[PDB]
Amino acid sequence: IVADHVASYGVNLYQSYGPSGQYTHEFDGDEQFYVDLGRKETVWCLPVLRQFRFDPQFALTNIAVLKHNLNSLIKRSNSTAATNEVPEVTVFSKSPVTLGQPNILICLVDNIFPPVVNITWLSNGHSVTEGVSETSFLSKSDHSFFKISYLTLLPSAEESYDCKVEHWGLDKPLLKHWEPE
Amino acid sequence: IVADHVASYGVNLYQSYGPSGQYTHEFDGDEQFYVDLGRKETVWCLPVLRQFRFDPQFALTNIAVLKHNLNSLIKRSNSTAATNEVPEVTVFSKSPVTLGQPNILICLVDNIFPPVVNITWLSNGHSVTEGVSETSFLSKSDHSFFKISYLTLLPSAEESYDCKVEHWGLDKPLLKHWEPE
Amino acid sequence: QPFPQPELPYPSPEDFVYQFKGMCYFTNGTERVRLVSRSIYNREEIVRFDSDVGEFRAVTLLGLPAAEYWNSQKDILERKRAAVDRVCRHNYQLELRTTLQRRVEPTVTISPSNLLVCSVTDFYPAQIKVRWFRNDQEETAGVVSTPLIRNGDWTFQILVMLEMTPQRGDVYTCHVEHPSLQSPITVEWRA
Amino acid sequence: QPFPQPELPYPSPEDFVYQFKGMCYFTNGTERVRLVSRSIYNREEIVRFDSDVGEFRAVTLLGLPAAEYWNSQKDILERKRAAVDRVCRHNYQLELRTTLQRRVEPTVTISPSNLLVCSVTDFYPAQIKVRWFRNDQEETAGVVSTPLIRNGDWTFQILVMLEMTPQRGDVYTCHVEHPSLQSPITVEWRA
Ligand SMILES: *[C@@H]1O[C@H](CO)[C@@H](O)[C@H](O)[C@H]1NC(C)=O
């Protein structure tokens, strides 16, 4: 479908594994907000959108409908389970690399299905905890997902990094290396 | 790209595994012919096209260029190998099932990459040889491939079949079952 | 106050691959013809020649040495620019006598499954329109159609299913239109 | 006698997933608006409501019971038919005040990698035009540009590389045009 702008009001997701759910709104491929289903609060991704209110109860009520529909389809589809796809991982910096200037490493994990993944960062081969964040699962027209993880860093000659991706479509965790050069 | 008709004159393929190559021409997504690289002869898929001649030496010379170009790119890319994708398999009949009427079982194997696959047929647990044929690897706009295998049959109440697909993207061979119902 | 939409309740070897595709795009016969030759390493297109741009252009950094070397050879550029006529338009004349003449009338079959399946099989070209009727009113809400199915043997098929409850005197009609047909094909089904 | 194109030589846990997408498609502001709500089982869309068709339609056999029940409730249908205005067009008014107002000027940097990389980073919206110049002539044959890169934080970036051989007195310019810019940004590079 061709359009000047495309929006999802919203992306509703519920899956048996967990079980887990997700509610987001998207405009032109970017996440406008998500609803924290556990805490029942709307978390705006864009500061200018904070001037609006969105009742988080809508997401909870909608996801509950998805849960009912999922149980019906599991029986009717004769327990047809999801197929694990091979995700595609790309690592790149947000800004041009300048040694000593704070930057952000971006790990794009594409072709995610089912939407269950672990995205972690390594620095000089050891796990990193501070400075890591990620988007929600972002929708694709083929109904798979992609997800983006961020790692703040100070580019230097003595630190190299890896984005570590765990997914059932991968027999081994996938490591995508990145160096400041 | 939007067009009334799209053609490939032609699809050229060469891969290190084997090594093996393929040369075909496609019009509106169907295979017009392939060149048997071993036997050096053009094999037309459509009978009306047999009125034409195509020098099989063109395919051999072109594939040789692909082999030379591949070796350069293997080094320039630092031996960046192909990623094994998960193929999607669907089995269906060419015609509606009528017991006693000759029919053809069709096994569509989609999202093939790299283009190395084994498609075989099973009947009551045994491999079938007679009445089996397949297309070449057919191109896709995302540069993966699909391939179609055919099994002629006389549908009966006591005969069921399976299409067996082996691919590096599958840890176990995939079997898609078919019954006359 | 963004307004959202609610959902409603339900009732191993290493392999290095190279590809070259000499593609032709046709619109309105040969009036509008575009040639795109693509060089692909694994699944990444690295360099292409688009007749709309008129020169080789690298798609990724891997293709830049090839694009520069080929663009430096003006003899190759001249013959590449002529390929829309020498290859695409030339081959289209062959298609006009063969592939574009191919007309295979569809076979239309109705078989029950409370679900009626109208199978429209073994037709070419792709253009097809299938409709369901219960008595003389078109049925659409209880209809599900598969996508167009490519058999790979230069024929297509499509299955159009209709949910129904049979009753005496009810006539169900599957209506099929295809470019090979002078009149639409109609097949009736009665309980 | 088909004429072909030559290539030239180089120099596990089980999971069941359900999705519902309340999508809106906008063209020319709110003049052309299309609503498509999709119900998806795993990766198979089973039923959808397209405002262009005006009723629920099963995409696969799995969606047929849902499509029949929803189409049977005319109250549900009437509210779905109004959603293109109540949801899509209504929400677009909010986007006009926010997302469609967002203007983030790109940062333009040139750094060597005989290869010059013009990094155009942290801009929004997507519309961008980047060109390379050697003195007074635009460079295109030796240019390779990445696709538009989505950072996920409501900014984009694009990297445009130029292969060049510097001479004395040569000035290379990266020319960037963006809707947020009153005048185009130009950054020069000298050896
Ligand atoms: C994610 O990590 C948790 C804990 O480390 C683990 O139990 C789970 O299996 C992981 N998920 C995947 C998909 O690997």
HEC profile for C98-139?
A: CHHHCCECCEEEEEECCEEEEEEEEEECCCCEEEEEECCEEE
Q: Please, are residues C124 and C106 in contact by the beta-carbon 8 Å criterion?
A: no
CA separation for the pair D171, D162 (Å, rounded): 13
Q: Please, are residues B107 and B113 in contact by the beta-carbon 8 Å criterion?
A: no
Distance B114 CA to ligand 1 centre (A): 29
Three-state DSSP state, B130: coil
Domain-located, residue C1: no
b/e string for A74-112 if b means 16 or more Cβ within 10 A? bebbeeebbebbbbbbebbbbbbeeeeeebbbbbbbbbb
Q: Which of C65, C83, C103 corresponds to the end of one domain?
A: C103
Quick one: A16 and A30 in the same domain?
Answer: yes
Domain-located, residue D122: yes
Q: Please, are residues C147 and C75 in contact by the beta-carbon 8 Å criterion?
A: no
Residue in D closest to B10 by C-alpha: D4
Quick one: A181 and A139 in the same domain?
Answer: yes
Three-state DSSP state, A7: strand
Q: DSSP for D81-98?
A: HHHIIIIIIHHHHHHHHT
CA separation for the pair D46, C137 (Å, rounded): 25
Domain-located, residue C5: no
Ligand 1 close to Cβ of residue A150 (< 6 A): no
- Exposed, middle or buried by CB within 10 Å (0-12, 13-18, 19+), for A144? middle
Q: Please, are residues D39 and D66 in contact by the beta-carbon 8 Å criterion?
A: yes
Return the ligand 1 atom nearest residue A167 CA.
13
Q: How many C-beta atoms surround the C-beta of residue B37 within 10 A?
A: 16
Three-state DSSP state, B48: helix
Place of tokens 């479509």: A169
Q: Which of D86, D103, D120 corresponds to the end of one domain?
A: D103
**CA terminus-to-terminus distance, chain B:** 41
Quick one: C135 and C168 in the same domain?
Answer: yes
Alpha-carbon distance values, C70 to A4, A29, B58, C83, D11 (Å): 37, 37, 20, 15, 9
Q: Please, are residues C153 and B136 in contact by the beta-carbon 8 Å criterion?
A: no
Indicate which CATH number applies to the domain containing A50: 3.10.320.10
Quick one: A72 and A133 in the same domain?
Answer: no
Q: Which two tokens stand for residue D147?
A: 């696709």
Sequence-distant (≥ 6) Cβ neighbours of residue C149 within 8 angstroms: B92, C156, C157, C158, C159
The number of helix segments (H) and strand segments (E) in chain B equals 1, 13
CA separation for the pair D101, D99 (Å, rounded): 5
Q: Which long-range contacts (CB under 8 A, 24 or more apart) does C26-30 make?
A: C26/B3, C26/B4, C26/B5, C26/B6, C26/B7, C26/C88, C26/C92, C27/B2, C27/B3, C27/B4, C28/B4, C29/C92, C30/C88, C30/C89, C30/C92
Q: Which of A81, A111, A139 corresponds to the end of one domain?
A: A81
Domain-located, residue C12: no
Is there a contact between B86 and A85 if contact means CB atoms under 8 Å apart? yes
Q: Please, are residues B47 and B62 in contact by the beta-carbon 8 Å criterion?
A: no
User: For residue C77, what is the enclosing H or E element?
Assistant: helix C74-81
Q: Please, are residues C22 and C49 in contact by the beta-carbon 8 Å criterion?
A: no
CA separation for the pair B43, A129 (Å, rounded): 60
Alpha-carbon distance values, A65 to A37, A69, C9, C154, D81 (Å): 14, 6, 6, 44, 20
**Residues in chain A, how many?**
181
Residue of D81, D88, D38 whose CA lies nearest to D63: D38
What DSSP designation does C86 have?
I
Residue of B67, B154, B165, B151 whose CA lies nearest to B110: B165
Q: DSSP for A93-138?
A: ESS---TTS-EEEEEEEEEE-SS--EEEEEETTEE--TTEEE--PE
Quick one: D63 and D112 in the same domain?
Answer: no
Quick one: A164 and A76 in the same domain?
Answer: no
Q: Which two tokens stand for residue D23?
A: 């999508």
Q: Which of A27, A46, A81 corresponds to the end of one domain?
A: A81
Pick A72's closest partner by Cβ from C1, C8, C10.
C10
Domain tally for chain D? 2
Q: Which of B38, B61, B81 corresponds to the end of one domain?
A: B81
Quick one: B135 and B121 in the same domain?
Answer: yes
Q: Which residues of A touch C5 (CB under 8 A)?
A: 9-10
Quick one: D108 and D191 in the same domain?
Answer: yes
Residue of B82, B87, B112 whose CA lies nearest to B17: B82
Quick one: D85 and D113 in the same domain?
Answer: no
Q: Say yes or no: B53 contacts chain D, CB-CB below 8 A.
A: yes
Place of tokens 């031996």: B79
Quick one: B63 and B134 in the same domain?
Answer: no
Ligand 1 close to Cβ of residue A169 (< 6 A): no
β-pair type (A103-112, A145-153): antiparallel
| Rg, C-alpha atoms of chain C | 25
Alpha helices in D16-162 (DSSP H): 64-72, 74-83, 90-97
Is there a contact between C119 and B96 if contact means CB atoms under 8 Å apart? yes
Quick one: A51 and A113 in the same domain?
Answer: no
Q: What is the dihedral of CA A73, A78, A81, A82, to 10 degrees?
A: -60
Q: Which of D103, D123, D148 corresponds to the end of one domain?
A: D103
Strand partners, B104: B152
Domain-located, residue D41: yes
Domain-located, residue C6: no
**Residues in chain B, how many?**
181
Q: What is the dihedral of CA A55, A60, A63, A65, to 10 degrees?
A: -100
The number of helix segments (H) and strand segments (E) in chain D equals 3, 13
Alpha-carbon distance values, D183 to C52, D105, D117, D175, D186 (Å): 29, 11, 22, 10, 9
Three-state DSSP state, C93: helix
Quick one: A71 and A138 in the same domain?
Answer: no
Residue of D82, D59, D60, D57 whose CA lies nearest to D70: D57
Three-state DSSP state, A150: strand
Quick one: C99 and C149 in the same domain?
Answer: no
Method: X-ray
Quick one: C117 and C97 in the same domain?
Answer: no
- Exposed, middle or buried by CB within 10 Å (0-12, 13-18, 19+), for A39? exposed
Alpha helices in chain B (DSSP H): 56-76
Q: Which two tokens stand for residue A58?
A: 């809508």
Quick one: B100 and B177 in the same domain?
Answer: yes
Quick one: B91 and B146 in the same domain?
Answer: yes
Q: Please, are residues C180 and C155 in contact by the beta-carbon 8 Å criterion?
A: no
Quick one: C45 and C115 in the same domain?
Answer: no
Is there a contact between A171 and B169 if contact means CB atoms under 8 Å apart? no
Alpha-carbon distance values, D158 to A138, C48, C68, D118 (Å): 21, 20, 21, 9
Quick one: D112 and D53 in the same domain?
Answer: no
Residue of C157, C77, C85, C93 whose CA lies nearest to C120: C157
CA separation for the pair C79, C37 (Å, rounded): 13
Ligand 1 close to Cβ of residue A170 (< 6 A): no
Q: Which residues of A touch D107 (CB under 8 A)?
A: 95
What DSSP designation does C182 have?
S
Residue in B closest to A169 by C-alpha: B86
Domain that holds residue A110: 82-181
Domain tally for chain B? 2
Is there a contact between C22 and D37 if contact means CB atoms under 8 Å apart? no
Measured between CA atoms, how close is B181 to chain C, in angstroms? 9
Domain that holds residue C93: 17-103
Domain-located, residue D9: no
Quick one: A95 and A66 in the same domain?
Answer: no
Q: Which residues of D touch C62 (CB under 8 A)?
A: none
Strand partners, D107: D121
Q: Ligand 1 atom 2: the closest Cα is on which residue? A: A118
Q: Please, are residues B36 and B57 in contact by the beta-carbon 8 Å criterion?
A: no
Strand partners, B134: B149
Domain-located, residue C165: yes
Sequence-distant (≥ 6) Cβ neighbours of residue C164 within 8 angstroms: C114, C115, C116, C134, C139, C142, C172
**CA terminus-to-terminus distance, chain C:** 54
Quick one: D117 and D167 in the same domain?
Answer: yes
Declared resolution, Å: 2.0
Ligand 1 close to Cβ of residue A167 (< 6 A): yes
What DSSP designation does C87 have?
I
Three-state DSSP state, C83: helix
**CA terminus-to-terminus distance, chain D:** 54
Q: How many C-beta atoms surround the C-beta of residue C61 within 10 A?
A: 18
Quick one: A137 and A163 in the same domain?
Answer: yes
Ligand 1 close to Cβ of residue A166 (< 6 A): yes
